Amino acid sequence: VSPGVLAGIVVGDLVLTVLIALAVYFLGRL
Amino acid sequence: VSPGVLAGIVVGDLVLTVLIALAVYFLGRL
Amino acid sequence: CSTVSPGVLAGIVVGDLVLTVLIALAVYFLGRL
């Protein structure tokens, strides 16, 4: 796999992890 | 890391990410 | 071919999981203030 893909994966991971953490949190606020 | 291996890591990690968030909030409201 | 070391890969995955815990904790702690 290419470093270009991996750059997307790593940064994507950071972003999605924050979004998931916050989505799950506010789901629990319903 | 092959594309197949990377794909398994992406999927497994995101499932686990959702559950970890869920678990932290669950424990936190006990 | 740039073969990645299994030790590094294992380390980074665990690293991600620990960071994930930390992110969830941060949300939790700041959320309840």
Ligand SMILES: CCCCCCCC/C=C/CCCCCCCC(=O)OC[C@H](O)CO
């Ligand atoms: C679909 C439900 C998945 C729930 C599983 C929880 C695993 C949690 C581990 C995550 C770290 C990343 C490793 C993920 C490894 C699991 C998936 C897998 O083995 O992938 C096979 C891949 O196609 C060839 O490596």
Ligand SMILES: CCCCCCCC/C=C/CCCCCCCC(=O)OC[C@H](O)CO
């Ligand atoms: C094959 C691999 C299978 C993958 C599975 C590995 C799961 C590992 C544990 C994750 C912590 C999640 C614990 C679940 C927390 C329970 C919270 C709960 O039941 O309450 C629901 C909610 O909080 C009320 O709306």
Ligand SMILES: CCCCCCCC/C=C\CCCCCCCC(=O)OC[C@H](O)CO
């Ligand atoms: C992605 C999960 C982040 C884990 C955070 C754990 C705590 C910090 C320790 C190490 C972070 C650095 C390791 C991850 C970034 C290094 C690998 C990398 O940069 O991959 C890019 C590659 O060059 C292709 O573009």
Ligand SMILES: CCCCCCCC/C=C\CCCCCCCC(=O)OC[C@H](O)CO
């Ligand atoms: C919207 C896009 C969403 C994308 C979702 C991504 C989720 C990836 C899952 C776990 C992060 C761990 C990634 C581990 C693979 C990269 C680290 C790696 O193998 O790098 C070792 C190398 O030696 C250093 O450059």
Ligand SMILES: [K+]
């Ligand atoms: K993650």
